[PDB]
């Protein structure tokens, strides 16, 4: 026998491949698995793990967030990398000339990038023109902005949103939420 | 592919420990010690026998 100091036969708990069956995503995984295996640039390994991520773990990245990243001191010429969708933002006043590498561009985002003289490229083109991720800047979208996240960890005095179907004065605003109705939690 | 015991395999013994050649050549395992004959207990230490 053995007095085990840890649970036996535990899987790593990390995704090792895309759950997706998109053949072209698999082609990209193939390219970046080669790159992460043969190049030891940390960027390629990060990109490889990113290609495995599920949809909610790849939030869309707006062009305004990209522009704020491009305004960082020394970053006006970096190649912006997004493993996910780049979306348009109609709140933006101006957008600069930039090279953005992404999985997907919405039509508005691509029109705005191209109109200001920039370049909208895919991840294989990025690998060809920067095999080690030289002069890149990875940008990630906000994971916790999801509406589902509002209801996580709900409980007394926690300040989270209730799971509720209708909104109004008759819907869960009485006893338990008001000192005039018993107590407030 | 196969662990070999140096205490049995002479070649593996030499691979791990080059000095094992000199130890055998010099007969270190059966070395005479040069000394004289003394009895340091012939006095008080003979309180080992009786008090």
């Amino acid at each position: 026998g053995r007095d085990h100091t840890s649970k036996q036969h535990v899987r790593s708990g990390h995704r090792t491949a895309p759950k997706s069956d998109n053949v072209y995503l698999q082609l990209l995984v193939k390219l970046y698995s080669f790159l992460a295996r043969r190049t030891d640039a940390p960027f390629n390994k990060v990109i490889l793990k990113s290609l495995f991520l599920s949809k909610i773990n790849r939030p869309p990245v707006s062009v305004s967030r990209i522009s704020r990243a491009l305004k960082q001191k020394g970053a006006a010429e970096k190649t912006i990398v997004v493993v996910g969708t780049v979306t348009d933002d109609n709140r933006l006043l101006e957008f600069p000339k930039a090279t953005i590498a992404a999985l997907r561009f919405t039509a508005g985002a691509k029109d705005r990038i191209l109109k200001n003289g920039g370049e909208a490229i895919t991840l294989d083109q990025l690998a060809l023109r920067a095999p080690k991720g030289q002069n890149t800047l990875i940008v990630r979208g906000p994971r916790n902005s999801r509406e589902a996240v509002r209801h996580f960890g709900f409980g007394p005095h926690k300040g989270k949103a209730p799971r509720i179907l209708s909104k109004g004065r008759k819907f869960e605003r009485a006893r338990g939420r008001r000192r005039s109705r018993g107590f407030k939690v | 592919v196969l662990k070999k015991n140096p205490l049995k395999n002479k070649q593996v013994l030499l691979r791990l420990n080059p000095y094992a050649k000199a130890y055998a050549a010099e007969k270190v395992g059966s070395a005479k010690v040069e000394q004289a004959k003394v009895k340091p207990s012939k006095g008080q230490f003979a309180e080992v026998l009786k008090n």
Partner: protein
């Protein structure tokens, strides 16, 4: 052969008050040195208010028999514990070594008094040198002039299971 006689010498660890603490010696009958030092500390913790952690063993030495092929009579003084109480007793043994007599004593107290080794303190083992010192008739009867005796009814040990000749016990 079960036992050896040891001297064990120990002292208290030196401190500032007592730079040269007094050396003490015990004669111990033990199977090996580990038990010998254990017994030394057992008796030192009874006799004195000392512990093993505040002391040290100085020396452990076999005490060989002086005349291993001389027949002797030993008197042994003992303290043992019964099921019911605590008793002193004195018994005599014939042997050629002190360790042989002590081993016989342990067998004898196991047999007649059901005294285990843990229940017995050996107060003193003394070679009785004058025949007048021998007090017990069960050993005294082997100290008479021209002792001779037969060994009636000899039983021969057989190698085979079946013997073709009738048994004999002559001798």
């Amino acid at each position: 052969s079960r036992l050896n006689e040891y001297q064990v010498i120990g002292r208290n660890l030196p401190t500032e008050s007592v730079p040269e603490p007094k050396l003490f010696r015990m004669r111990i009958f033990a199977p090996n040195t580990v038990v010998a030092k254990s017994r030394y500390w057992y008796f030192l913790q009874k006799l004195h208010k000392v512990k093993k952690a505040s002391g040290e063993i100085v020396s452990v030495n076999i005490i060989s028999e002086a005349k291993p092929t001389k027949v002797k009579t030993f008197g042994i003084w003992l303290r043992y514990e019964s099921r019911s109480g605590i008793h002193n007793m004195y018994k005599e043994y014939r042997d050629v070594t002190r360790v042989g007599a002590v081993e016989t004593m342990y067998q004898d107290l196991a047999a007649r008094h059901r005294a285990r080794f843990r229940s017995i303190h050996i107060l003193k083992v003394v070679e009785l040198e004058k025949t007048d010192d021998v007090k017990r008739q069960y050993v005294k009867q082997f100290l008479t002039k021209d002792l001779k005796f037969p060994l009636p009814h000899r039983v021969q040990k057989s190698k085979k299971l079946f013997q073709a000749t009738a048994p004999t016990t002559f001798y």
